Structure 1
Amino acid sequence: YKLVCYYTSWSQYREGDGSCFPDALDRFLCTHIIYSFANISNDHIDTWEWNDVTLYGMLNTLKNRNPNLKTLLSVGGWNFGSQRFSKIASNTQSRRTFIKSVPPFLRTHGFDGLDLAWLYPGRRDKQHFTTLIKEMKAEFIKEAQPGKKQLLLSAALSAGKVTIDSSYDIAKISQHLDFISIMTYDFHGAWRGTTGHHSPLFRGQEDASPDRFSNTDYAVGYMLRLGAPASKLVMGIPTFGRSFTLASSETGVGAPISGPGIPGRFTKEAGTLAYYEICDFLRGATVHRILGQQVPYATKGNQWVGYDDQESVKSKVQYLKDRQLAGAMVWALDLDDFQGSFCGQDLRFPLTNAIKDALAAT
């Protein structure tokens, strides 16, 4: 199995114990660590943060004592400008300048591959996305062709049925990608105005949600049916929760809300919490395992958060092993309890170690 784990470069700026640099990462935890994100500037791949070159080095030094560890650089992101990617991918000359810029940059900076994070191609970009992936892989084969270790090409793909149908030619891109990470979280399965879990494993109660699509199992089965080989499909597991402010005394799934949850102290983003912030939240909270969805929510006062814990990520690993998938993907290492100081067990990376342990289990 693969355990593909993201590190985000803006996590260095979080206050106090929230600050995360690559030298806090456990070199033996994951098989692949992906650094997010690189820019595209003047149609060339390029750095984003002022100190990316320093942080690239802190990450790649982890391979010194773990020669099996691979690193990739993820280009794009969700505040990149899909308009910007679209223009780069449709223009024949821009696309070639970008492809040609990628292997020198990865070799210069010590990376083993590129992860494409175009979030998200439009219906009008579906074929451009295929062409981009085909031509990028072709350049990687050419660059290695004299006995080099070939660079890896991965892509992070939406788990949302509407985006999958509009944006991706799954069967074609799967032939060229070394692996696909399906982003099986941030689902919006609840009726408008109500709570729901953003990463359920299955639909659960049939008469309680609008659609059958907003869950991990539907997305995985669908992408396999569309032609992604199981041996290339890496299943996303979040180390963050999505939260809501409750509008009444009701606290179950589908309870009325007035808006997103109160921001966490470190991540400062209403509607989201890192897992270590959730560990803090859990003191005084009530935890419920959602029947049929195989994941917990916690509620306290007027707050409600749907998240994954050690038990639920082991169930998700059992699921992916039953489906013979390639492994698990984790967003993100800096949202796990990487310090080991919040989740009361003294253990660093509690959620990602739980995933690692389940993948290794027999």
Structure 2
Amino acid sequence: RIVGYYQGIRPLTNDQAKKLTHLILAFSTPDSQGNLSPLSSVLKQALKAGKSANGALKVMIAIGGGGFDPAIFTSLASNSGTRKSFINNIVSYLKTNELDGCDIAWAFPTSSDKAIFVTFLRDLKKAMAPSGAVLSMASAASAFYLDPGYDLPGIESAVDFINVMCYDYYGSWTKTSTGPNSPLFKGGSADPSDTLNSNWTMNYHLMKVYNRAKLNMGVPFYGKSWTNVGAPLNGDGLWRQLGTYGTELAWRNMGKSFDMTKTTYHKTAKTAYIYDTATKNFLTFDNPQSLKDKAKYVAEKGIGGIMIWSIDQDDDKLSLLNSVSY
């Protein structure tokens, strides 16, 4: 599988559509009653572009998302009556909007949600099964969220695949140092963390699920910046004194603001970063090399596919998607 999430940053091109097996439009959100927000114009355009260019492509709607209040999912899913009506609305929405499935993006289920989340996904799949609509969900990357909220065997028993979000390992909340948004591995002896890497997150999933073919390893087409960054903490320039958080930058916008010839490729972590000694700017990101190393890992581990957040962040020449694709 090559599962591409899509945010409406720019049109979906005919070339992109052919490189995916699944296109996940993001997002629709439910209200407190379980009514889904209408599909936006930019997302509807991508549905049409995708199906026109690739008649095998499955176009799905992601429901929820990182900005969406998880207490609304709690409310809808915990009451058997509202669960039923929410599910019926989801299935009606797929029909009305000519969609092939849906992704539940609940950020994040708590310990009180763990069992009802599984019931919701099981009951949703039952309602979707006659039409063959594809069901997926997005899963977290650290034990902090995974252990309380995610019964991975129960989830697996309901869904067609699990989109594992192996990114956002460092970010605006980080107080200790710079670090990689999405490395493949722990970065050697200077790395202060054993777990903030894609390999740890995927291994956690591999030890819990029955069939690893049901997993997709998520990869980001964006990176993150800090400014006023200082010296390495322990001899390795990936982890540097802070500094002020910048923002999340799509790949397509990085090279206009950073000199990409200064890229450092961390050979142990398999991650790309730039520290600019003239400006003290820092950029952690994924590039063609990091994605090639990640695709190789997915194949080596027998993981069922690669998920991308998000394909519209790629440049006009599809540097990132072609690296995953080729």
The question of whether the paired residues in 2 share the 8 Å contact of 1:285 and 1:298 is answered with no
Deviation track 1:207-232 (CA, whole Å, cap 9, x = no partner) reads: 531x3111100110110101152111
Deviation at 1:24, TM superposition (A): 7.0
Give runs of ≥4 in structure 1 deviating > 6 Å: none
What are the superposed Cα offsets for residues 155-178 of structure 1, whole Å, 9 maximum, x if unpaired? Answer: 011111211101100011101110
Q: Say whether the 8 Å CA contact 1:75–1:114 is kept in structure 2.
A: yes
Letter in 1 for 2:239: G
> What percent of counterpart residues are identical?
27
- Closer, same or farther: CA 245–61 of 1 in aligned 2, 3 Å: closer
Structure 2 Cα separation of the partners of residues 315 and 159 of structure 1? 19
Q: State the AA in 1 paired with 2:320.
A: L
Question: Which residue of the partner structure matches residue 134 of structure 2?
Answer: 152
For the pair 1:307 / 2:285, whether they are aligned, the reply is yes
- The one of 187, 209, 213 aligned to 1:204: 187
Cα distance in 1, alignment partners of residues 80 and 312 from structure 2: 37
Structure 1 residue 284: deviation in Å? 6.8
Post-superposition shift, 1:43? 3.0
How has the CA–CA distance of structure 1 residues 203 and 46 changed in structure 2, closer, same or farther, with 3 Å as cutoff? Answer: same
Q: Any stretches of 5+ residues in structure 2 without a counterpart? A: none
C-alpha distance in structure 2 between counterparts of 1:58 and 1:227, whole Å: 33
Equivalent pairs, count:
320
Structure 1, unaligned runs of 5 or more: 12-19, 262-269, 341-347, 358-362
- What is the letter of the counterpart of residue 225 of structure 1? M
**Structure 2 residue aligned with 1:134:** 122
The corresponding residue for 2:95 is 107
Q: Indicate the larger mover: 244-253 or 303-312.
A: 244-253
* Partner in structure 2 of residue 167 of structure 1: 149
Aligned residue identity for 2:287: D
For residue 169 of structure 2, the aligned residue among 187, 191, 207 is: 187
Contact 1:180 1:234 in 2 (8 A): yes
Once the two structures are superposed, what CA deviation does each residue of 1:233-280 show, in whole Å capped at 9, x if it has no partner?
11111100122123435581221012202xxxxxxxx2x111012122
Pairing partner for 1:319 from 288, 294, 297: 297
Q: Following the alignment from structure 2 to structure 1, what is the Cα–Cα distance between the partners of residues 153 and 189?
A: 30
Q: CA deviation at 1:65?
A: 3.8
Counterparts of 1:1-362 in structure 2, within 5 Å, are 2-9=1-8, 11=9, 20-22=10-12, 26-41=16-31, 43-48=33-38, 52=40, 55-141=43-129, 144=130, 148=131, 150-188=132-170, 192-209=175-192, 211-227=193-209, 229-250=211-232, 252-261=237-246, 270=247, 272-283=248-259, 286-300=262-276, 301-337=279-315, 340=316, 348-357=317-326
SS at match of 2:115: helix
Q: Which secondary structure state, in structure 1, belongs to the residue aligned with residue 29 of structure 2?
A: strand
Cα RMSD of the aligned pairs, angstroms, is 2.1
CA distance in 2, matches of 1:3, 1:215: 21
The 8 Å contact of residues 7 and 43 in structure 2, kept in 1 or not, is answered as no
Q: How far apart, CA to CA, are the structure 2 residues paired with 1:114 and 1:284?
A: 37
- Is the partner of 2:4 in helix, strand or coil? strand
> Please, what TM-score do these two structures have when normalized by structure 1?
0.83
